Amino acid sequence: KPQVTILATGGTIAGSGESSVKSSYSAGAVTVDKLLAAVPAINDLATIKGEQISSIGSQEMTGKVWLKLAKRVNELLAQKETEAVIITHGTDTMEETAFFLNLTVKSQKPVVLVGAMRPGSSMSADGPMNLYNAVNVAINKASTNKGVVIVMNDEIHAAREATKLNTTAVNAFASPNTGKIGTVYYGKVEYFTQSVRPHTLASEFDISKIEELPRVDILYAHPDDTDVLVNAALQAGAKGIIHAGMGNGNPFPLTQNALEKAAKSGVVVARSSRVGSGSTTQEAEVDDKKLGFVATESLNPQKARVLLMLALTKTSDREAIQKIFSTY
Amino acid sequence: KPQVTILATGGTIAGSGESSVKSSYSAGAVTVDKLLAAVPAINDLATIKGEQISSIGSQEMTGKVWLKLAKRVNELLAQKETEAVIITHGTDTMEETAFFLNLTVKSQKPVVLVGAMRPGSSMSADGPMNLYNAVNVAINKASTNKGVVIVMNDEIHAAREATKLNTTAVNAFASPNTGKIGTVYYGKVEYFTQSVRPHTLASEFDISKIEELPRVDILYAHPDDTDVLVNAALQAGAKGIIHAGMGNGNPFPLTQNALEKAAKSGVVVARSSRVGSGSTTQEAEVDDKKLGFVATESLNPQKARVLLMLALTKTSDREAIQKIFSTY
Amino acid sequence: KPQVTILATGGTIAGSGESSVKSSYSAGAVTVDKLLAAVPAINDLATIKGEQISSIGSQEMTGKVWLKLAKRVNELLAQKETEAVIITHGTDTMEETAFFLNLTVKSQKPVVLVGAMRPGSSMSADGPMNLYNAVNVAINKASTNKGVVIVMNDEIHAAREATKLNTTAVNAFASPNTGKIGTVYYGKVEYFTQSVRPHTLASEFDISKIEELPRVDILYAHPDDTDVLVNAALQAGAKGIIHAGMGNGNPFPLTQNALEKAAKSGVVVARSSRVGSGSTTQEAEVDDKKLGFVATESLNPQKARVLLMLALTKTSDREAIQKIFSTY
Amino acid sequence: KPQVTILATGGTIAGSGESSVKSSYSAGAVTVDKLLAAVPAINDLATIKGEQISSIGSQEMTGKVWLKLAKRVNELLAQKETEAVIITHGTDTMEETAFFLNLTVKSQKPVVLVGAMRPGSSMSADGPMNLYNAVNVAINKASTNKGVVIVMNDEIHAAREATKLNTTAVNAFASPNTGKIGTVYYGKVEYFTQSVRPHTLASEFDISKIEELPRVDILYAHPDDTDVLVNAALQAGAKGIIHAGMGNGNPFPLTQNALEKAAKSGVVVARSSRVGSGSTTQEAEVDDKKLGFVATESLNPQKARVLLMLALTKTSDREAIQKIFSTY
Ligand SMILES: N[C@@H](CCC(=O)O)C(=O)O
Ligand SMILES: N[C@@H](CCC(=O)O)C(=O)O
Ligand SMILES: N[C@@H](CCC(=O)O)C(=O)O
Ligand SMILES: N[C@@H](CCC(=O)O)C(=O)O
């Protein structure tokens, strides 16, 4: 049977309350033992080990955890015995963790993030099925070299494209620019597409010696906008700013002036959009070359932040970072 | 024939270049004369007058223009001869202006906002059809008391529900929580639903004596978030803050602490979400009553901002503002 | 506590296996007693009675059952004590039953259809939550006069607009032309819109003395299409034919000729579309007046069939039936 | 400059009326000359030749035209000088022609289908931009080996996945199971995914010596369904039947019995769904092995028809055809 490690970043996504008997197997983490008791069919698919990487809600995630998780995933996947890793994660920032891993995991072996929009105690909890399906995706031959994937609601989403698009629905995850790459229905895995943007083993980024990521703030644009938030990000040591602009990444004039000053000072300014989908394009209304900005193209603000953070580990050159956004 | 006024807030959304002859009719604004020359079929539907309210891209909109536009719309709709108003508007912030008007226009006569995702000079420009359709909606008997509507891409969207959800597509407008309320296809208007949330003549808000709206900032949440943007909004005199939270309106802890301090100081803190759709609900993970926050429910950050601005013209009381979010 | 009757048309949508003790309450139908044991929170919301109207999968539904169900719903809602009816139903044809009821139930009291995309025995079964939410919708004050609604996946869909749009997903139901009219999240009910098309108490249709509905067939259009299926429907006594046409309701020429002959013979031919959404419009490529056809407008083939069946209970006049499609 | 041939299957999708001067260039077909006059920017991108393959609306398409078009595309793409083919096509059945070509074109050179939801004479006609974008996609280096694509509304759709899902919208094309594979915005082409299902040069099908395709009918399921349409398809010599079932491909019992008889007689019965999206799966409620049916999985009825037609040129064996549906 294939060997898989489940890494938990918080509590159980499946089941609730104490175990009905004390297990003879220790997977390596109590959270994971609870998952194996709550979804026992997964034991027939794989030999499961468990680790607890963090113990937080995903809204409390930090770069320090991202680095710890990525370094551990790389170690695990370098082992001959380990076929895949599954990470259980809160849904709120799952997309940011998945995208970070998609650029930092140096392996073609599957890495699957999974969570639950309803708590395990709830009526009609989604976690048990989502986890069962995640294991099936992780052990599937066709999952190799698909990049980091999010598995939710019977769907397989590429990390580059995935986002949480709804506050509460079980079907909150979507890939608004491309769609799911595959499906998983009662464990039956089928892929229909794959990303043509480089990831994982093909990514230039390497975080193995990084202990802290560069600070990148995100700003929300609107009518009658301000310069004070740009100024405060500068004052706090921001190395980059994502601007979630109006429509196709457009700033309000006062804010544009402050961002221009930021970029002149050596802080990378990258234009995204508040709208939810589509590309924040080059050569539209904003003269990025003249102003010293980068266009994030077909991402969203929070994933653009992750990419800008990685880019800033090695360069602040506007052209090099535009090429990064135009590649990954 | 019905009398309609078109109010322009920027340039022409239809046609391009100089007129092929100097018209004998002056509608009242050069922009509108250019529209009538570009889309002549509209002259057979209505007697059109025109005014230029502002001359800006929608990303440069301000509360001063909103107040001027709302006051003029109210004057026009009080006239017995005026059956409807159409407003040509940039797409970027059309949703904000429409929502503002939906709560400040004291009339059941139709108010239609309309724009173009492609410039009038473009191949396959969408403005001409959008405008033609907008006129048809404005004069239709069934458009009375539907509230302010956005007419784009053959669809009629209720202002409360509409948003721009794509950076570049002609079909960028959506109503992600409810759908379009009607269709307009080569001028044929059909309504299938209407909003049950109060608007227009039923709204408590009145801006007739207001010269400046309350300052409301918006913040974009993410992992490893900060307190410095909250602090800078306070320092700049913010009367409210919309927090675009992670998932179902969740803040990062450092930011939550700053927002709690803000709320205690009498700055209203309203929780929305960065995700795109769904309600930012009460009684989920955030204890709003204990922390002193409002849950914006089924809006998005930029429209919640509008509603919080209007609320702040009347009150800063947490319970009263929650009731406003729970009503409108 | 409000009194509600649950009518079951098949098996349990929630729970699985035998009861853990023999209940002291008999709701009136074993299926319903099993539902109350599987979702016990519903007993705190309402006094529930149960009946078994049929015992079938929804793919085996027939007009005979539709008539039995509608007549019973009308009887129940005429009782002073009965506040609402919930019907548990298979998902496959739930939209057809809901639409039929929306035109035949002569009451403003709520009628809610609910089902489950996963069996009650499944991991992460959706039935328990869907039922819980259905009860909450049924007892909600704002549900009065909303027409027949489908409650699935935390959403409230108007019967006129609802369809099953996916083969397996828990979120398979949608209203592709208008969206959900409301939401229901852990029992909290909110409406955002309502239908402006007449239903229920305002419908002209009355089935109280009808024992069999008129035969209406549906045909699926494609390239290199045929006349033999039109001919066989005629031969079998079809009173009406829905043609699920290519694009905006377009037939292949051989098929068009056969439909023209059908319409001349007194069989009503109504044009819908195979595409999934939008209106099959009048005055597009097909000259409906000349050919003797009706345009179904903003429905789909299966719901158009239901409406044509009801129309044919009293008329086969082309113009009267076009007015029916243009009204309901 | 790259050489491209445009093949027209009907009239012009761009421009309208007579030319303002008689061109000195003849592209080879009057339709294509009219396109070059309507969209002159395409002449700077490629050397265009034109041919008129057929002169019909897409709702009049037949297998004879498909065979002529596929054979001509194969000849053209075998020429060293020809870099790509573009096919102008009515929207109604574009998806069927694209899917057919995706399995019969033996080349990795780009094949792009393109049409217009509005006539060229219309206000805000979409043909010009669609065609301009189609040319850009056809000449793009990254379009090699993507399979046959549909380019509409600034989107690139894989032929396997594309469908027309709305009757009238300019954005009617979608890929409901996977999404667009790329974008094309004012000619700027970007791919984000590709199909992992074999196509074109990797397809087993070869139609070079085929003069007539096997007859395949499609049936629309509903409650109170019949056996007479199955029987009439058998009588007319159907070699396969696509059943557009209720929900996850479910038949009504009377119809199931007729289909079982059909299958026993050696007519292939393939289960799809009327719903719109999702897989019609194996091992759900229908015992395909016992009844002698194929499950079409993640297609729709009209594309399943195409694939079943091509399958029937090689085999009628149930297992072999299931493998074909499970591969392509
Ligand atoms: N909001 C929490 C709860 C769990 C969930 O929704 O996934 C988180 O993101 O961790
Ligand atoms: N972004 C500008 C350009 C026009 C448009 O996008 O509609 C505006 O919103 O006014
Ligand atoms: N297909 C069956 C099973 C139950 C379900 O999917 O709702 C039905 O429609 O009754
Ligand atoms: N229905 C016709 C008209 C053109 C169009 O809809 O694209 C066809 O498909 O050819």
Numbering used by the authors:
A (entry chain A), B (entry chain B), C (entry chain A), D (entry chain B): 3 to 330
From the primary publication:
By administering enzyme drugs called L-asparaginases, which act to quickly deplete Asn in the blood, this drug specifically impacts ALL cells, starving them to death while leaving normal cells largely intact. WoA, like most bacterial Type II L-asparaginases, is a tetramer built by a dimer-of-dimer with 330 residues per protomer. In our structures we observe that the overall fold of each protomer follows the general two-domain fold of bacterial type II L-asparaginases. We sought to clarify this question and to further explain the substrate discrimination, if there is any, between the two forms, by solving the crystal structures of both variants in complex with either the product Asp or L-glutamic acid (Glu).
